[PDB]
Amino acid sequence: APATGGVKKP
Amino acid sequence: RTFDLEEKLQTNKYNANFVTFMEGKDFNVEYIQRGGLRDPLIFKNSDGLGIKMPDPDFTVNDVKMCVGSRRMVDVMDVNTQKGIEMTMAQWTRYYETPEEEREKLYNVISLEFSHTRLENMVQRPSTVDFIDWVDNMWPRHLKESQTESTNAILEMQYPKVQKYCLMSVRGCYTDFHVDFGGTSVWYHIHQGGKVFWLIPPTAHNLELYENWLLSGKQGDIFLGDRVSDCQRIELKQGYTFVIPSGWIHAVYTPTDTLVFGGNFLHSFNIPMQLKIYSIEDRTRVPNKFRYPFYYEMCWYVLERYVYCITNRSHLTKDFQKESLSMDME
């Protein structure tokens, strides 16, 4: 479960 | 949802006049200095913008080939507005499935393809390069060190949010929202078309928006109906759309569409950018859906202005030498 960022979602 | 999306597309009540239609060569730094980029802009053609786009018949499979077949992508379940995850090969497989055979409506709006083969095929409007905080504020040697093409946070060396590939099938809907960090957005329709509901970031509407989030009943209320002024605007193929900071918008996909776009922070509407960030804070938006290194970028902005004006640096000696080494290139 690698952390991510800058994901576009409402 | 409980509201009827169909009538929301038919009615003429959303006849507010917010959007400004412009010529590309009029979209320069002086314009931003004059207006502060407060108004939604549409460029019916590309002339003067300085953008670069892939072949007009570019396919989703071509997108897969350029980013990698095993590249994991964030997919949106339209019915629930939740998020799932699949490979680009799996996504391509779904997108290539005939319209009447798709078991479900899926939407990909978060494919950041910087540092892939796709990167150099798509170019931002030139003016954005002059004002984007990532290109002018963030330490250059850090950004240039980026190798990871995905948005994994541990490998991210800078706000990787400049180039997005959005792939939407006919019928896709994105509910009302404000892009992370209060970022402004450039939006180019490569193939297809989009339908936008626009709401101005007034104090009353931002409060309405926030309570609408905390309400949790976002699928039971069409936000454009409970504001005084909303505009429904249709974007066509070849159009470029620029969304100012803080503007609440929903989007519908009337046909299979391929869109390239990106977000950016600038120095001409910092207050609104900070406004939107605090809303994210109060509404408990998970960090994965937020602007990466937001406050770090803010600190770097203050340093640049102070140095560019007074010639006094507040970076470490090592960081000053890193920059000095790049000035001699």
Partner: protein
């Protein structure tokens, strides 16, 4: 005397007021910054001296922040 737009003067003010009042566990001072307290001090001085920038002369058509 450089000339900043009122958009920038107003924005920089909110920035320093914001970054200055964040608690330590929320400040997020980047690794590249040396003395964030000193940086904050110079910004207030800068804004004080730039408070009377002429709006017209500010429309230069080129950003104050650019790489050498």
């Amino acid at each position: 005397q450089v000339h900043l737009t009122h958009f920038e003067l107003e924005g920089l003010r909110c920035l320093v007021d914001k970054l200055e009042s964040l608690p330590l566990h929320k400040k997020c001072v980047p690794t590249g910054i040396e003395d964030e307290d000193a940086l904050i001090a110079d910004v207030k001085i800068l804004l004080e001296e730039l408070a009377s920038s002429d709006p017209k002369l500010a429309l230069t058509g080129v950003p104050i922040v650019q790489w050498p």
